[PDB]
């Protein structure tokens, strides 16, 4: 069943990556629109670049969340593929996955 299992794993990872890309695109359009808002009124360069730094930190957090999930799935797959007797699994969440 390795064929089908690796296939489902690949599809799951793809769903995660699609979600990440959609979130990042949404947030990027949002930051562009918000910086346009700020430039519409009296825009203090300092405040606008603060808003830009906030948006970039949010995009970083989104990417890092997605990457955490991708690495979790990678560990799950590697562990199952190499699973054998006498191996110790110390993570409750990893074992239950």
Q: Where are the alpha helices (DSSP H) in 1-97?
A: 2-40, 45-82, 92-96
- What is the distance between the terminal CA atoms of the chain, rounded to a whole angstrom? 18
Query: Helix 45-82 and helix 2-40: axis angle, to 10°?
Result: 180
CA distances from 65 to 19, 22, 47, 61 (A): 11, 13, 27, 6
Residues in the chain after which the backbone breaks (C–N beyond 2.5 Å): none
Contact 61, 24 (CB under 8 A): no
Which residue carries 């009124």 as its tokens?
41
């Amino acid at each position: 069943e390795l064929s089908t299992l690796e296939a489902e794993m690949a599809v799951e990872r793809k769903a995660v990556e699609d979600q990440r890309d959609g979130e990042l695109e949404a947030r990027a359009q949002k930051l562009e629109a918000d910086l346009a808002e700020l430039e519409a009124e009296g825009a203090k360069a300092d405040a606008r670049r603060k808003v830009r730094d906030g948006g970039e930190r949010e995009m970083r957090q989104i990417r890092d969340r997605a990457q955490r999930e991708l690495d979790r799935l990678e560990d799950i797959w590697s562990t199952f593929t190499k699973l054998a007797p006498k191996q110790l699994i110390v993570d409750e969440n990893l074992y239950r996955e």
